Amino acid sequence: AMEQLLRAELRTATLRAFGGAGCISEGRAYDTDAGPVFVKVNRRTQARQMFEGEVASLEALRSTGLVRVPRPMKVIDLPGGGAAFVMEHLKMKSLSSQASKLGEQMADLHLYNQKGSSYVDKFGFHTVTCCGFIPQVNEWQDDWPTFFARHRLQAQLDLIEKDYADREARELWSRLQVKIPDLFCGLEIVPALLHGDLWSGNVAEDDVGPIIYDPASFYGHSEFELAIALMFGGFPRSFFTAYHRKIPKAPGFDQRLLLYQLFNYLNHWNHFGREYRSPSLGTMRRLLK
Amino acid sequence: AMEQLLRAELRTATLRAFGGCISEGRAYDTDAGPVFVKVNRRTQARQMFEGEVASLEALRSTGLVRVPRPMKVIDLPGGGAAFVMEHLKMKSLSSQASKLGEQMADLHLYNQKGSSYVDKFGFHTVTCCGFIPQVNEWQDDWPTFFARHRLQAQLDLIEKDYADREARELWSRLQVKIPDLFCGLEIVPALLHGDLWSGNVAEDDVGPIIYDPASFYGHSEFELAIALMFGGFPRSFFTAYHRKIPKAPGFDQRLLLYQLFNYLNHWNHFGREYRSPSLGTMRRLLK
Ligand SMILES: Nc1ncnc2c1ncn2[C@@H]1O[C@H](COP(=O)(O)OP(=O)(O)O)[C@@H](O)[C@H]1O
Ligand SMILES: Nc1ncnc2c1ncn2[C@@H]1O[C@H](COP(=O)(O)OP(=O)(O)O)[C@@H](O)[C@H]1O
Ligand SMILES: O=C(CN1CCOCC1)[C@@H](O)[C@H](O)[C@H](O)CO
Ligand SMILES: O=C(CN1CCOCC1)[C@@H](O)[C@H](O)[C@H](O)CO
Ligand SMILES: [Mg+2]
């Protein structure tokens, strides 16, 4: 898509995405006596909490045996604030040929909780995981639209009120809250373990297959995983084809997709500022149309 | 340092870095070279990128500082635009800091010294500081340009979006005091990068690099305010710079005025986290 436009506008046969590293933290690879390691540094005061949530997320994904992610090694307090997180170094290129395989794996990951050796019947998580540098509440809830409205959308919009005092966001949210249960089409939603931040910048591949990293995990609706993948692009079509061969789109998928993308726009407004006010409000208005 | 801390916590004799964003775009390997692509999906994207292209071109024309070469601005289906530029292998500014200090002082001296002389403050097109378009209307007088097209623009947005009483009253008092900071000094228009914080500078094996400009002709000292206020520049950058352009009398108080602009811009971009520094800087200017 964007790659097709670039190939045409620039006149290139090939086009391979590549590549301190990251938007939240600084990341560098080091060679050590025991092997290569990768180290993320964040100087903010909440850094340890963020990295401990990433450690818990990595451990939950690794326990499934369905996807490859870096092994977490150590979280280290930094003099003068913040923390460093050391993990296994992985040789990686951007996701291309392994996209359909990753689609299969992410669908199996979401379906894992329905396997007989998994018993999680509520939405949430056993510990705090951060969306970027913003701590999230993962308090267990039986009802997914309640969990998502309260501990994702409302939490972001309360931060928008505090920091931006945005009248339009407040007024639109009140109207949207009324609509949210209708978007679920009377469906029974079952918990699915999510990577939680499956942007194209957080997936990659090597010669064995795809790799994913930087998770912010919780038990959620499987569909929420795909919203960030779709809105910022970067995943080949074959990723989604393989995924939906295993988990078909339930009724109302397209409208829930807007609701889940809304969360990501609000989170980008809080992290990155007013640039993201227009898509946030615009998505709310589209849901209310 | 952190490297010693890592050596100790991991219990390793060696710790050898290898392998060497900001909510922009991605790098792509292309048949004709590597390229770097910035994506902005909003409707104002093209205008913003055209300002960046114009800023990069004005800086490139001096031949004094290395910037990425702009290639193409492309309209995106479904809104916004992509900006393709030459890819540069880039590391954080350290060993080339002193060189960058020299080059930025030469950049600021280029206008008065060259043969074609821009004799007003402003720019020939709109350039954005971050995501906010600036008015660059030519003005003979720098305190007028800065008060109207930088400080007042920001404070009008703060009145609109926050209705902040304290900002309003402090501005009423501060506005009158601004000329005192400039009396008895000659101000010559100087081409500025316009957004020289530490995250917009880098280096490679050949020398320093600067990028993401928001250029205009301004007072040279304004350039340094964001560099100082958010840190990240080695002392040798400022030492080299001020060997060529020493601090004129009143430098520290003008520095507060210029940092105020940046605090207000951060309040408009990121919200009330920056209200306290904005108001506080105003109070320091009024003491
Ligand atoms: N375990 C790892 N080994 C090697 N490289 C990594 C590893 N994890 C991440 N990377 C590289 O670092 C980049 C950013 O990492 P990420 O964990 O997404 O940081 P952030 O939370 O700051 O966005 C990735 O694009 C990838 O190239
Ligand atoms: N021309 C380029 N070549 C290679 N890397 C680049 C180039 N431009 C930017 N980058 C990378 O992107 C980062 C942010 O670039 P910037 O232009 O400041 O984007 P933003 O507008 O999102 O802040 C830089 O620190 C650098 O690592
Ligand atoms: O930062 C992230 C993704 N955005 C970065 C800049 O714009 C393009 C995509 C993710 O890690 C996450 O969705 C959120 O920002 C928390 O950091
Ligand atoms: O982003 C910028 C600088 N701030 C980033 C986060 O906090 C530290 C400094 C600059 O590009 C510009 O001055 C403006 O903030 C719009 O982005
Ligand atoms: Mg920048």
Q: Could you tell me the distance, in angstroms and rounded to a whole number, from the CA of residue A191 to the centre of ligand 1?
A: 27
Dihedral (CA of A174, A178, A182, A184) sign: positive
Give the ranges where chain B is alpha helix by DSSP (H): 2-10, 45-62, 97-113, 142-146, 153-162, 165-177, 220-229, 235-244, 251-270, 275-286
Q: Looking at A142, A197, A207, A254, which residue is catalytic?
A: A197
Interface test with B, best of A9, A44, A78, A232 (most B CBs within 10 A): A9
- Sequence-distant (6+) residues with CB within 8 A of B55 are B127, B193, B194, B213, B214, B215
Ligand 2 centre from A220 Cα, in Å?
34
In a domain, B12, yes or no: no
- Does the Cβ of B104 fall within 6 Å of ligand 2? no
Query: Are B70 and B204 in the same domain?
Result: no
Q: Please give the Cα distance from B128 to A117 (Å, whole number).
A: 55
**Contact at 8 Å (CB) between B268 and B132?**
yes
**Claim to verify: residue B277 and residue B151 sit in the same structural domain:** yes
H-run or E-run covering A81? none
Phi-psi map region of B212: left, alpha, beta (phi>0 left; psi -120 to 50 alpha):
left
A161 CB-near residues (< 8 Å, 6+ apart): A169, A170
Burial, A258: exposed, middle or buried (Cβ in 10 Å; 0-12, 13-18, 19+)? middle
> How close B17 gets to chain A, by Cα (Å)?
4
For residue B106, being part of any structural domain is answered with yes
Q: By CB neighbour count within 10 A (0-12 exposed, 13-18 middle, 19+ buried), where does B113 fall?
A: exposed
Whether residue B92 is contained in a domain is answered as no
The answer to whether the CB of A198 is under 6 A from ligand 1 is no
Contact A10 B39 (CB under 8 A): no
Whether A17 sits inside 8 A of B28 (CB atoms) is: yes
Which stretches within chain A are classed as H helix? Answer: 2-10, 47-64, 99-111, 144-148, 155-164, 167-179, 222-231, 237-246, 253-272, 277-288
> In this structure, is residue B280 part of a structural domain?
yes
Residue of B67, B105, B95, B81 whose CA lies nearest to B200: B67
Strand partners, A77: A83
Determine if ligand 3 sits within 6 Å of the CB of residue A132: yes
- Residue B44 sits in a domain whose CATH number is 3.30.200.20
In a domain, B191, yes or no: yes
Residues of B within 8 A of A5 (CB-CB) are: 74, 76-77, 82
Tell whether A6 is in a known binding site.
Answer: no
Residues B160 and B221 in one domain: yes
Residues B167 and B249 in one domain: yes
Same domain (yes/no): B73, B103 = no
B3 within some domain: no
> In terms of domains, do B70 and B113 share one?
no
Number of domains in chain B: 2
Phi first, then psi: give them for residue A29, nearest 5 degrees: -100, 140
Question: Relative to the CA of A134, which ligand 3 atom is closest?
Answer: 16
Co-location of B141 and B74 in the same domain: no
What kind of experiment solved this structure? X-ray
* CA distances in angstroms from A207 to A37, A82, B278, listed in the order given: 19, 35, 52
Same domain, B200 and B249: yes
Residue B10 lies in a domain: no
Helix, strand or coil for residue A278?
helix
Residue range(s) defining the domain that contains residue B62: 21-86
If asked whether residues B141 and B73 sit together in one domain, one would say no
Residue B1 in any domain: the answer is: no
- Write out chain B residues lying below 8 Å of A36, CB-based: 18
- Cα(A22) to centroid(ligand 1), Å: 6
Place of tokens 């402090």: B170
The single residue listed with the structure tokens 């990121």 is B270
The structure tokens listed for B66 are 């290395």
Does residue B132 sit in the same domain as residue B204? yes
* Neighbouring C-beta atoms of residue B101, cutoff 10 Å: 25
> Distance from B22 to chain A by nearest Cα, in Å?
5
* Nearest ligand by distance to the CA of A271: 3
Q: What is the CATH number of the domain that holds A30?
A: 3.90.1200.10
